[PDB]
Symmetry: D2
Subunit: 231 residues, 4 copies
Amino acid sequence: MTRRILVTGSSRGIGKAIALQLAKAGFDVTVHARSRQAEAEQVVQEIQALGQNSHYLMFDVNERQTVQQILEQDVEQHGGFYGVVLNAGLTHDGAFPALTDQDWDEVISTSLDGFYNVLKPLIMPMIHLRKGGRIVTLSSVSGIMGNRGQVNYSAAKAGLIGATKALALELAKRKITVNCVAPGLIETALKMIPLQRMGQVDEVASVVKFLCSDEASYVTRQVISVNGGLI
Amino acid sequence: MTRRILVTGSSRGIGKAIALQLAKAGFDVTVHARSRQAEAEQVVQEIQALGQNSHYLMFDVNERQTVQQILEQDVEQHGGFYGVVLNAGLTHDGAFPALTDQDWDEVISTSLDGFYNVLKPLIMPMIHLRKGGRIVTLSSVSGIMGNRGQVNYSAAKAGLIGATKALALELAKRKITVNCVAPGLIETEMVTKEHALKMIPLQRMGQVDEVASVVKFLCSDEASYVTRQVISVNGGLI
Amino acid sequence: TRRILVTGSSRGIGKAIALQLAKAGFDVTVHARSRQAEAEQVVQEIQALGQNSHYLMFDVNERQTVQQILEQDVEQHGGFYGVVLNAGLTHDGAFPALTDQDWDEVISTSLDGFYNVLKPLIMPMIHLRKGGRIVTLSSVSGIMGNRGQVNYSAAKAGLIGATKALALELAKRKITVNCVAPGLIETHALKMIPLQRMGQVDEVASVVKFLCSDEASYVTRQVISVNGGLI
Amino acid sequence: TRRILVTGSSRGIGKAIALQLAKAGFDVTVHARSRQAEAEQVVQEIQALGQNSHYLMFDVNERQTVQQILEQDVEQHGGFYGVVLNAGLTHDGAFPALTDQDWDEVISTSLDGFYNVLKPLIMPMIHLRKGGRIVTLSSVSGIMGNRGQVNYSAAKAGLIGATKALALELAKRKITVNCVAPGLIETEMVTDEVKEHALKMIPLQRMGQVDEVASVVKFLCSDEASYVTRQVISVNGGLI
């Protein structure tokens, strides 16, 4: 059976570019979105047109019990996921003393609760494939160095890095690599970027696609920055 | 007058060592504990015996509304804090598939909601002192490199680093430095050790005062050009 | 056709890089210090893969000889679109026991190698007016240091600094400059590697090949570790 | 009393380090490449603070001279408990425009300086049987690179790798080995282009003072910093 990869937030933007590149690489790809159902179906159709199998799942990554039920049912129907790309996240920018409770909690939970809620039901189905696996998280340059107006987002994306590195250590014995891709400023003050432009969605997706390939078998526990030389 | 520093989790261990070194350096130091009131009052009397003023505050850093009321009342009675040391944290170790919801949620929130719940009521009072300031968070080598059985704690302590660096950028123009201290294996962490000592180049656990000395240095006036940093105190582990 | 110089490509990691870049569609120029027959065999393999190839022989420490050979090669065959700098050797020993030669050979082969090879090639690369690729090979010991390798750790760390600075100078010409830092590669720390095995040469070469590809256009100034999760 | 060598200590950051260490109670040996009268001024200030001091003259690149002077000094005054390596120069320029001298003198002064100064002093330090302190001075350019400084970035990054490796070799001797990486500091002979670019990026919006760097070195040389080793500590106003 063909190896299948889940990409969260894959109805548009970076997530969609990742989904399409993984399909072109020969993976079956399961699309996900929180609410844009018609958009998710368009991506499913494009993946099918590439010759792979696809369908979409709808959930808010913060809804722990609903995510568990949807993923357990999907694994029962279609087998375990060989790969998981955790792409969905959220910003609520503002100066730290001006941040509301919602600005803080929604940003923290979407990245960190999302990591737990999506990956917890899928670790054992991945191990049961007995063929290794791939987990890639999407952080941010702000998770590496911090950013004004983004104490919450910098915390959420930095926490993702720590979770990724720790999980890489736990799953290494099962040949599951676990890595993080940290984009800079992407199209979806450029005076600080050495390449002097925003990045394109495919320039991020190509890195995720490489890490998901069999060729990247000795890369794990890493944060790979795709940021045009910003840091 | 005398600059005052809040140290969370200072009734014992590393937090206590930090509070006593900061008192010896000439700060007034406010002690904090979640629930061990008698322990906290003992540290208060030690700080008084070291020549500084002290009292304790009791709260769970996760209780957002309670923390705000307690800190806002304390600032009204005693003035803004010049410094805040965020030392209190929590572990719930276990392999990622073994972790319970509570194991995950309590570890993430204690560090990350603790940061928001304690610092949000205190940032503007600190700025209004108009004399700079100091914020030091306590992370962990696990936040830098990850650790087996600690996916939750690694995420919490790495998240603290991101928050620290971003806050450093916002507060630099007020001459408030914001830094992180990341201890390795310290004598107050209960372990069963022989493998860990083989990984540490110095081949021994750190002592509480070896961590507190770094925090004390960052809080000093001499550390005025150090901000946005993670300083590891780990015997060479990484 | 874009042409890439790979130093030290008659065997080992350098050979695997040369062959992967040939399979990707680049013309590849092979290099060796002295093993001429070995270099010719790699050239013949690149030709059998359908690309043009020849070899160049030089000690990377012979500054003037390197300049003459490379300037003549660029006049005969055009500027290099890419350069993979794979230059270094170890002379392990306790620091106070290292000889002058142990220190100077290790420092110079990596850092004078960088200067001696790249200085004559930067302007011919820019004059192609089509971007470019530079990849240097460092080591995990350049990132974190290693007992018995104060000299090698210094040389490898120095390559990382030179790479990051050169990335800043060349970004405006759309030349990316990156570093690949291998861990323990097959060419007893195994209880220390999470994947519990040495890397294979193609697991390093795959990362170099990805960085040289058009897809990697927003990645620059980076050190990418291929070390099985060692750090 | 414990004795510390500080190289390049006749002026600037090195002088600030030497005076802060003397105030902390170390005997301090001053070093300079060529300015003998400048060095003697610092010696006299350290003596006035109540510690023992003298100066040593050498180019850190002249390997055999460094070895003879240092081994003679250790025979006369005992081993050094601490060494602060403050060694390096810049020769800025676009990489294709760097001359052989621009490259070689920048690489060698930092990396050859590390080997030339420290190799004769490691065993005398170990033979004290009371631990020790080694601190190297790198730069933010060694951590992230800088335009016009491919040579300096390489030299200062190399210093970091050497420091971390030596920390591992000496950890069981209770000798800590660390690196301090200043950002843009007053008195630093830097180009206007490097200086203007740095100011816009520094969150504190100012250059550092020499004592803001020396205080970090002094802390690492103190007995309290005994569990800090293998580290690079940035003193850069938040630049990175």
